[PDB]
Symmetry: C3
């Protein structure tokens, strides 16, 4: 029961809602959770939203399961940073003799891998800077800019985005991070969607 | 004297500046003030700048009189909010048996109506979140994100927008709030446009 | 050795990266340095990114040399400033009698010129408010909105953008601001690019 997680478009006739995984699997070094979807803004496919992601730099993007990514969300990788121990001007780029100044890989600043946990809701037009971590169950307010990590089950917002308040009491969260319903076999999840939607799965589990 | 507040396009040979009232009047759960306008970005009508407004939720949007709204301003209503007492994943949206998990109207988080006062100036590309109130005479800097209310005649900006400074001293602000010139017939407004534009209208009516 | 700063499209078979000087030189009240470029976001040339620049208000826009300008960066000049000694409604704008109230040059808030230094790297989709001054060698994070001045070799970001941290010790900064390699003839810069890329030109030149 439920939709086929391998379709690009789970809702027949609808080219707006699209599962991210079947779209991004072809991409080298990008990991995606099963039911994570993207609400297209103007019809585009999520791959257009990941920028400056180059193999040779080897940074990775990670997206957990059951994530709801709003339209316009932009994930920027490390291929946009410039060398900064000196001038930020990209001399090597204009050639005509300047290539000699190409930078060695260990010279480029690479923050790290980007990792978005499970059951995460990212509002529209959110921009995610390189090498950031977003915990399970977190909520990011529309039009936010994430320059730093976000703890699990936290509501954050702003530019730069900051944690505003815990979604639930530590108690609940600890048990929630404990149960990990996103990891259960779908058929078990199919029988508890109700308890998962109102958090009562904590007492059953 | 002055433009016809019922015309979509007041300025002649200029399909960019439009009077909001005419455009949004056919709409439900929406009230707009007399002379408030919108400076189109790419020639789009202001109605396309109001997102996620479903009558079913019954949230209302109110805009006062004499408001200057920059291009790109986006008004987000309550239709996009996700149920959040548990998992924020919209299972009901994907059918195949998940259809039965549709939320209950009183299970969706509603933030209230969006109310924008009179004589408000909204810079360009501002995004206004659900259930916000911006008092009269306020100025919201460009590219701001309004998440909480803004007091009258205050200058606000940023993401999340914050009140930066009062435009005038308490006394004056109290005064203007009380006076409420935007609520005068036009013959009078038309005759004191210059005192409205320099704030002396206070000394007159006091 | 290196491209001719006078070429519009310096790199070849590339209509996205452009040298600003040649393009903006043909503009009133704009001063652009030599190697500074702009990485187009969709083909659009940089002049389309400068908004509300009316010669009548006489505000100027200056931009140093060797600046890396990311795609979508926007510059906002004083042409969008509403009068605010009182009401902010552009009555004059609508005519039909209201024109009498056109504001006097000395009544509009002109915050001054906008000055961007040399060796300045501005991230993508950054918005620059009017009357701002960014320092030599500063880095402005992508998606920021610059409302106040930014110091040399300072890093900054956010909406509003705030200085986040210095790029090097005071000493080093003091020197580079003294040496100003960006004002040297290219023939010379050409044989130090390496010492300029790792900051060692401070031990040589001094
Ligand atoms: C974040 C959001 C869910 C609201 O959270 P919520 O549970 O309703 O909580 P509240 O609105 O009451 O927010 C509480 C506080 O956070 C602040 N806040 C809300 N959004 C904020 C933001 N982006 N940045 C900073 N603070 C923010 C409020 O101003 C408030 O301040 P206070 O506690 O000091 O008084 C909503 O603003 C949002 O972003 N929705 C997403 C819309 C979207 O993009 N949908 C597309 C996908 S379908
Ligand atoms: C808001 C605005 C009017 C400036 O207000 P102002 O009276 O000139 O204010 P100032 O320039 O003196 O700035 C005052 C303070 O607010 C801050 N400020 C200005 N814009 C800000 C913003 N968006 N967020 C946070 N702070 C901001 C300044 O940093 C400054 O700090 P300080 O008090 O420590 O000195 C202008 O920035 C603006 O938004 N114009 C709108 C342009 C537009 O989009 N027009 C289209 C419609 S016609
Ligand atoms: C700004 C940038 C260079 C990062 O700064 P950095 O030297 O790597 O510094 P770090 O992020 O490691 O740390 C600096 C601090 O600033 C914060 N920070 C980063 N970006 C920020 C922003 N926009 N606003 C506020 N703080 C920011 C970090 O969270 C960090 O917090 P801390 O002081 O508590 O540790 C990078 O985010 C950036 O903007 N790159 C430009 C990308 C682009 O658009 N390129 C197009 C040109 S071709
Ligand atoms: C973002 C940036 C410049 C942009 O402002 C200009 C453009 O958008 C246009 C563009 N840039 C390019 C092709 O068109 C281009 O070719 N770029 C863009 C990204 C990497 C390389 C490049 O050389 O990477 C080489 C590898 C090919 C070996 C090495 C790793 C160096 C990269 C380097 O110094 N990065 C700093 C970033 C400079
Ligand atoms: C940004 C803004 C209003 C915008 O919301 C309206 C528009 O974008 C569309 C538009 N604006 C105009 C013609 O269409 C127009 O004519 N504008 C745009 C910019 C100046 C004048 C204007 O009045 O110029 C006259 C000169 C011709 C003498 C004087 C100098 C005063 C103008 C005044 O109060 N400026 C403040 C700006 C208010």
């Amino acid at each position: 029961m439920g939709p086929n997680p391998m379709k690009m478009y789970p809702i027949e006739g609808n080219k707006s809602v699209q599962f991210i995984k079947p779209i991004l699997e072809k991409l080298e070094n990008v990991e995606v959770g099963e039911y994570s979807y993207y609400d297209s803004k103007n019809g585009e496919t999520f791959d257009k939203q990941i920028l400056y992601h180059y193999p040779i730099l080897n940074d990775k993007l990670k997206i957990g399961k059951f994530c709801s990514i709003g339209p316009g969300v932009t994930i920027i990788m490390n291929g946009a940073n410039h060398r900064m121990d000196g001038s930020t001007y990209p001399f090597n780029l204009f050639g005509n003799g300047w290539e000699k100044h190409m930078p060695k890989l260990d010279q480029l600043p690479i923050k790290g891998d980007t990792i978005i946990g499970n059951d995460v809701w990212i509002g529209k037009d959110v921009v995610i800077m390189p090498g950031v971590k977003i915990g399970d169950g977190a909520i990011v307010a529309a039009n936010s800019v994430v320059v730093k990590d976000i703890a699990p089950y936290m509501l954050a917002g702003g530019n730069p985005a900051n944690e505003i308040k815990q979604r639930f009491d530590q108690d609940t969260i600890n048990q929630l991070l404990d149960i990990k319903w996103w990891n259960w076999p779908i058929d078990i999840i199919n029988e508890n969607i109700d308890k998962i939607l109102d958090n009562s799965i904590i007492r059953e589990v």
